[PDB]
């Protein structure tokens, strides 16, 4: 395994600390990857507030999230403390309107 009871507890706490939490390569102002950039732009377009976490400077967290989310890469988007999806799924839910529905639901709880 790549995670422990404490790591899992912290991750659960981390993804629930804000309504929308984005795990990316780089920072919102300085995306290190095109895939990470697309999600940030999506989120900026919708005017939804969010927390961005750079996983390029913390391997334990990176490897733990891959297992926690059961998704091998980043970006990884969380909404309402539940894993929403990686790049492809976030882009599609954006075109579809499902992304917005999810965020609203989260913002209004």
Numbering used by the authors: 65 to 173
From the paper:
The crystal structure of AtGRXcp has been determined at 2.4 Å resolution. The structural model contains residues 65–173 of AtGRXcp, the chloroplastic signal peptide of which is removed. There is only one protein molecule in the crystallographic asymmetric unit. The structure of AtGRXcp has a glutaredoxin/thioredoxin-like fold with a core four-stranded parallel β-sheet flanked by five α-helices on both sides. A long groove is observed adjacent to Cys97 with a width of 11–14 Å and a length of 16–19 Å. The groove is formed by highly conserved residues present in plant monothiol Grxs and would be the binding site for glutathione (GSH), i.e. a γ-­Glu-Cys-Gly tripeptide. Structural comparative analysis shows that a glutathione molecule may fit into this groove, form a disulfide bond with the catalytic Cys97 and interact with several charged residues including Lys89, Arg126 and Asp152. In addition, comparative structural studies and sequence-alignment analysis of monothiol and dithiol Grxs reveal that monothiol Grxs (e.g. CGFS-type Grxs), with the exceptions of ScGrx6, ScGrx7 and GrxS12, have five additional amino acids (i.e. Thr91-Arg92-Asp93-Phe94-Pro95 in AtGRXcp) immediately upstream of the active-site Cys97. Most interestingly, similar to dithiol Grxs, ScGrx6, ScGrx7 and GrxS12 lack these five amino-acid residues and are also active in hydroxyethyl disulfide HEDS assays and have GSH-dependent oxido­reductase activity. This long unique loop with five additional residues adjacent to the catalytic Cys97 may be a key structural feature of monothiol Grxs.
Arabidopsis chloroplastic Grx, AtGRXcp, was the first plant monothiol Grx to be characterized and plays an important role in redox regulation and protection against oxidative stress in chloroplasts. AtGRXcp is classified as a monothiol glutaredoxin with a CGFS active-site motif. Monothiol Grxs contain a single cysteine residue in the putative active-site motif CXXS and are conserved across species. It has been shown that monothiol Grxs have diverse biological functions such as protection against protein oxidation in chloroplasts, biogenesis of iron–sulfur clusters in mitochondria and regulation of iron homeostasis.
